[PDB]
Structure 1
């Protein structure tokens, strides 16, 4: 959604997007809501983000985030901004994997709301 998101990621996520929305009952609208700062703690959306992250090997089975690869995949300017934010917001914490991702998403968005994007 933010205008910085690399064109390539739209194609790259297309397979897992579909699998992850189906697995979690996600709708397009929930996704669109996020860019606008309207993230809700609902499994259809929070587990969807976990699902997408796992598909890119960015989380393990306990929603521990691979910070190095996550940051490495971001464009230059986002990477700089994310380094600080992710130092704060990582390691993840929460009651389950989906909540861990929600907490992370919310933590990032407090300071860098354009940095945590969902598609």
Structure 2
């Protein structure tokens, strides 16, 4: 659902976050297919990108309002519902916190969790 202009807003942060964490595009594609394991190279990537867009703070607490605001009108009710179930985050560290949220959201609504 991401609009095509988001993709250059994000390009520099994407390149940075992939390089910092050893993330591959293949791993990003996998998350988008609904497959996600608790591997730091992908989970720290997701944390990295959320932070980049100011959607999480230094302990992976989620700014849900800022998050919903980046979603299409048609997705927001469902997204707000799932965030109701899946927040607040919890986990062993910032990456694991986002792993657990990604899993939660994917289990429960699997049109909401896209990873750029």
TM-score by length of 2: 0.97
Give the gaps of 5 or more residues in structure 1.
none
**Could you list the per-position Cα deviations for residues 71-96 of structure 1 after superposition, in whole angstroms to 9, with x for gaps in the alignment?**
11101011111010001101101111
* DSSP-derived class of the 1:7 partner: coil
Return the offset for 1:112.
Answer: 1.1
* DSSP-derived class of the 2:59 partner: coil
Q: Between Structure 1 and Structure 2, how many residues are aligned? A: 116
| Structure 1 consecutive aligned stretches of length 4 or more whose deviation exceeds 4 Å | none
**Matched residues in 1 for 2:10 and 2:36: separation?**
20
**Matched residues in 1 for 2:111 and 2:33: separation?**
9
Return the offset for 1:21.
Answer: 0.3
Give the gaps of 5 or more residues in structure 2.
none
TM-score by length of 1: 0.94
> Conserved in 2, the CA contact under 8 Å of 1:35 and 1:114?
no
